[PDB]
Amino acid sequence: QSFTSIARIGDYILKSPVLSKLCVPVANQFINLAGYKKLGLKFDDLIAEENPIMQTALRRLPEDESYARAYRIIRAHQTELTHHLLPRNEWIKAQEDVPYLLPYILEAEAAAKEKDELDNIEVSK
Amino acid sequence: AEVTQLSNGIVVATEHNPAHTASVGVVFGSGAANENPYNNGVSNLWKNIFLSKENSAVAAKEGLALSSNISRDFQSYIVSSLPGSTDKSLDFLNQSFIQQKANLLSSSNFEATKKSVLKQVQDFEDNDHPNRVLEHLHSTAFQNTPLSLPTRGTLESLENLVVADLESFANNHFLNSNAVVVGTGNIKHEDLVNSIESKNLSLQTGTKPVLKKKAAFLGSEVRLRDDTLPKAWISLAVEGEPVNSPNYFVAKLAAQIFGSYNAFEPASRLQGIKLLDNIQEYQLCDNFNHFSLSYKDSGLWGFSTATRNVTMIDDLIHFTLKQWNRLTISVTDTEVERAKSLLKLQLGQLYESGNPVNDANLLGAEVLIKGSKLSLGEAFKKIDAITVKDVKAWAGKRLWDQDIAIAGTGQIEGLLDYMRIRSDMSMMRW
Amino acid sequence: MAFRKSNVYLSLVNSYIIDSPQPSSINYWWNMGSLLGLCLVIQIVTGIFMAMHYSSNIELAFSSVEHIMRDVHNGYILRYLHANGASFFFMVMFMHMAKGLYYGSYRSPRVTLWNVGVIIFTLTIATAFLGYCCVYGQMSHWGATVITNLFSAIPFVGNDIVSWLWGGFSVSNPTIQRFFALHYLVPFIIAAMVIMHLMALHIHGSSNPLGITGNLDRIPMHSYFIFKDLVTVFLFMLILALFVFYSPNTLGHPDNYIPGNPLVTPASIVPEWYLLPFYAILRSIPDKLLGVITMFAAILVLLVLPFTDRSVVRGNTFKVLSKFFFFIFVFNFVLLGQIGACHVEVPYVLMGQIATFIYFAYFLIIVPVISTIENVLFYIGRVNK
Amino acid sequence: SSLYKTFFKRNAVFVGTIFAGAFVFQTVFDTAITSWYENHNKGKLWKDVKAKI
Amino acid sequence: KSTYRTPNFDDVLKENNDADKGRSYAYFMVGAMGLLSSAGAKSTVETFISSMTATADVLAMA
Ligand code: HEC
Ligand code: HEC
Ligand SMILES: C/C=C(C)/C=C/C=C/C(OC)[C@@H](C)[C@H](OC)[C@@H](C)CCc1oc2c(O)c(OC)cc(OC)c2c(=O)c1C
DSSP states (O other): HHHHHHHHHHHHHHHSSHHHHHHHHHHHHHHHHHOGGGGGGGHHSSOOOOOOHHHHHHHHSSSHHHHHHHHHHHHHHHHHTTTTOOOGGGGGOOTOOOSSHHHHHHHHHHHHHHHHHHOOOOOOO | OOOOESSSSSEEEEEEEESSOOEEEEESSSGGGGTTTTTTTTTHHHHHHHOOOOHHHHHHHHHHHEEEESSSSOOEEEEEEOOTTTTHHHHHIIIIIIIIISSSSSTTHHHHHHHHHHHHHEEEEEEOOOHHHHHHHHHTTTTTSSGGSSEEEEESHHOOOOOOHHHHHHHHHSSSSEEEEEEEEEEOHHHHHHHHHHSSSSSSSSSOOOOOOOOOOOOOEEEEEEETTSSSSEEEEEEESSSTTTTTTHHHHHHHHHHHEEEOOOHTTTTSSSSSHHTTTTOOEEEEEEEEEEOOOOEEEEEEESSOGGGGGHEEEEEHHHHHHHHHOOOOOOHHHHHHHHHHHHHHHHOOOOOHHHHHHHHHHHHEEEEEOOOOHHHHHHHHOOOHHHHHHHHHHHHHOOOOOEEESSSSSSSOOHHHHHHHTTTTOO | HHHHHEEEEEEEHHHHHHHHEEEEOGGGGGGHHHHHHHHHHHHHHHHHHTTTOOSSSSHHHHHHHHHHHHTTTTTTHHHHHHHHHHHHHHHHHHHHHHHHHHHTTSTTTTTHHHHHHHHHHHHHHHHHHHHTTTTTHHHHHHHHHHHHHHHGGGGGEEEEEEEHHTTTSSSSHHHHHHHHHHHHHHHHHHHOOOHHHHHHHHTOOOOOOOOOTTTSEEETTTTHHHHHHHHHHHHHHHHHHHHHOOOOTTTSSSSGSSBTTTTTTOOOOOTTTTTTHHHHHHHSSSSSHHHHHHHHHHGGGGGGGHHHHSSOOOOTTTTTTHHHHHHHHHHHHHHEEEEEEEOOOOOHHHHHHHHHHHHHHIEEEEEHHHHHHHHHHHTTOOOOO | OOOHHOOOOOOOOHHHEEEEEEEHHHHHHHHHHHHHHHHTTTTTHHHHHTTTO | TTTTSOOTTTTTOOOOOSSSSSHHOOOOOOOOOOOHHHHHHHHHHHHHTTSSOOOOOOOOOO
8 A cells, every 4th residue: 555545545534623533542542552662663664665665765765864763673673582672761752753754755656656657648639 | 941953964952041151062872882892982082082181271261161971872072151152162162073183183192181081990990889880780781782881981992992993983973963963051042053054064974873783681790799898889770761762751750769868868767768667777778779770772770779787788688679579569659659759859950950061961862862852841741640550560561570680899798699689579479 | 705605505505594694583483484394304204214114005005004003113103203293284384374474474575485385385285185095094085085076066077087086986096096106296396395485585585573674683594593493393393292102193083093985984074183274164155166166265365465465564563453353363263173173053054154254354354454544543643744 | 482471471380370280180190190000901900800700 | 801891601691582481491390390299298298197097997887
């Protein structure tokens, strides 16, 4: 599933006051139960990168963010292999769990989608 | 638009467009295709003495510009000047092809021109790899035939030539029935045709040039391997179409479908060319370009290319030739329509440039073969007329399962055996 | 350059078992792979040794097996090892399959890896059934019968394929002798199929429990995973020994100690424990043809997984709704196998049908529906645009 | 040859055309051999000794 | 020796009057080879397969 599609459906739930109040709480709850935060990782880190779009995005992701992501991941494996979680004060906080990679992806998907369209545009005289 | 043409004792053709300059010249219907394997380059020599320092200083004082060009089917001698000095041109041209046809051919001027075209032709064979290969494609494609002789001439035949050869050739070739005087710039048709009808004479009238043996295409290859070169320049084509052929434009359009490309230009990479998706993943080449070379009796349809990815040369070939396969079985409408638009554009930039000598070399060319010039408008008309069904019929005749001619120099170790390449000219089917 | 690296044969051994870069975090579920390798060896070695005493001739078949038990030195150890080694092969195979199914190993670039694995599953089940026939006990004969007849379901050529396989009017000498022949052959194919599974593994490496990339922190296969693997190897042998020596027949069926008889199918006929879930799925469809199509489908449906899992992240480690529904599938699978050992009686038939639905509905409905929801859930839970 | 250009028109024989032809052959070719063989051995065959009975 | 001076192939180059001769001969050969091979394959396959079908001694009609 495309992030273009995820954000299309997500924003729509977010933008409606009715759906918003009924979903987001369940959402934050589902997120706390997942637990990646207790392993010091932002959800964007969890996105699978073995595909061109993600490679394109990670390539385009500015240094500071990349080196940090690198640390976060290395840190997670080390923690995971020890069968512990990090000390609570190291847990990625709510306002830290920011979708940093998301825009680069959305842009990369956008670019890809267009090329595909322009590669099959039919002509009508 | 324009394009007028009337015969008198010779044949005059012009096309004037109020520009900035006026150019007049004589185009002879014989070039390298009319040379012999042993006097090859006799024409590059004629061109070079015509542009001689002695002969150039003359027309210079008068304020004229000298420009010559050697080809396969024909060759020309053109003079450019200001719009009103059209007479000044006529004097110099008629002076160089009637009176001074005893001079110029003077030793120490010929011995100097001989050394010029020698350190010139050698320089080309030593450094202009892409075109040297392009010239060798003809050498092998048309081997043992008129079209197989190089314009600049061989490096051996060149050093054996003498003033006697220049004269000899010139006599059987620089005739009247084998010449057409061209005027391009802004001088009226009636302003030159009259200025020409002034000075009478004939000069060997009634004589026709020697005939020969119709050029032919043969499946072959010449591999000029040189591991010391940094790249690998290779050229590959099939028997193409000749000028004034029912498919003169269908063929030209096909080449445009794959067009040309230059890995280093951002804009060249974004082109609407299907083959591009394959070539860019591993950078299979630095540039390639498709052509549809048309000559009097034959032609060459294919592409030239340069790459540094010497380990993946077989993929460059494979992807390319498999793309060509499409022209017979699956070429699309939007591929054709793009081709048209781009062909009309690049064809336009040729026929209507800001250079009279250019219009001249193109004018003399057609009136010498078809006795008339086809107006760009008529062109666009025939081009827009081409359908997919047409492009497919042509591909099935000229491309699908047909022999090819290969030429290459540099690091071509990776270029596979003829048969492999020859096999990608088709595709498996039930 | 070192030798283990430069030699044509050791470099292979080297890049696969010594220098191979592994993700530091991989848990013990990653130990199932080598266990299967061991299993393949145990089966093959034990088999060839037993084969020196076996007689495929239908009149001699059952007795040659007893001759192995009663006269061959350690013959019983050979037989009990082969037979139990066969069940462990499946207990492990199932775990190996499950781990992957959980951690989304069938995804991303590892599909071909997963697809090869599915073939090995179909082949192993086949090899196993061919070998079970060689004892020619009651279960043997009837297993031989029913299974070959599975093909009589094919519309036109049906019966012809069946009698072709039998090589006679029914399951007789020709059947048992060609079945041994084939039981010997397939293992070597499985072995080949394994090297491909390995080649497909080797280009991308193993995944890991986090389901993310392991490129940032690698540790060589040697002296870590060679020793970690040893732990499970021993643990594995310890439990297999407990069965082979102290409870050799618990995993079997008593009917197989009675020589096969063509005129009497025992009222106690039940498939091998590892085939039960599939047996159950077939029984749950009251149509002959649909019964076999559905059963074969239940195996082929695993190929669908890389397309129905719409999640944007790999594995179940961080998915609440997926971890839940995963176990619902696991237990459902066990219930399926339980219904199989049961009779075709009132509450069980309907149960079998509800579960069959669930089984298929897992790969086709739940996973895609659930993962899409989780993708959205993951998004809205932190986006404040 | 012009016989090839009428049937297949300068295109190699298609894989489907090959198989199709392959079947025809099987039967045609076989009967031919079987016949030549039976005839050559006339008087020795069972069909022949069965008639003298 | 100049590279534009192509060697002599007049010992092998066919004097064309029937341009598609080499092609017509090759393709027939190739196609003919293909014909006989499918037949031979079909034949080999059938031999092995049919060696599994019921043996003479077991067709005992009781
Ligand atoms: C010839 C080599 C040989 C190979 C290789 C072999 N087997 Fe066997 N297998 C036998 C023989 C002989 C028997 C009959 C004696 C017996 O029952 O152990 C047998 C019997 C069996 C049985 C019947 C169980 C029982 O009642 O003993 C199973 C199941 C089995 N094999 C599974 C396998 C599997 C699974 C593999 C491979 C992964 C395999 N075999 C490979 C020779 C082999
Ligand atoms: C239905 C699928 C499937 C079957 C059956 C299967 N494999 Fe795998 N195997 C996988 C996949 C997928 C992976 C990659 C999992 C990962 O590392 O994330 C894998 C990985 C492995 C590994 C690496 C260690 C591990 O457990 O991750 C080995 C070795 C291996 N398999 C061996 C085998 C052998 C030997 C057999 C059977 C004789 C077998 N596999 C059957 C799916 C399968
Ligand atoms: C040479 C090879 C040949 C001819 C064919 C082999 C291939 C077939 C298989 O797949 C590989 C096959 C093993 C199948 O797979 C769908 C398994 C899940 C088995 C399913 C199976 O087992 C039974 C069994 O064991 C029994 O024991 C007494 C009895 C049985 O009913 C009485 C069954 C049964 O009713 C079914 C459906």
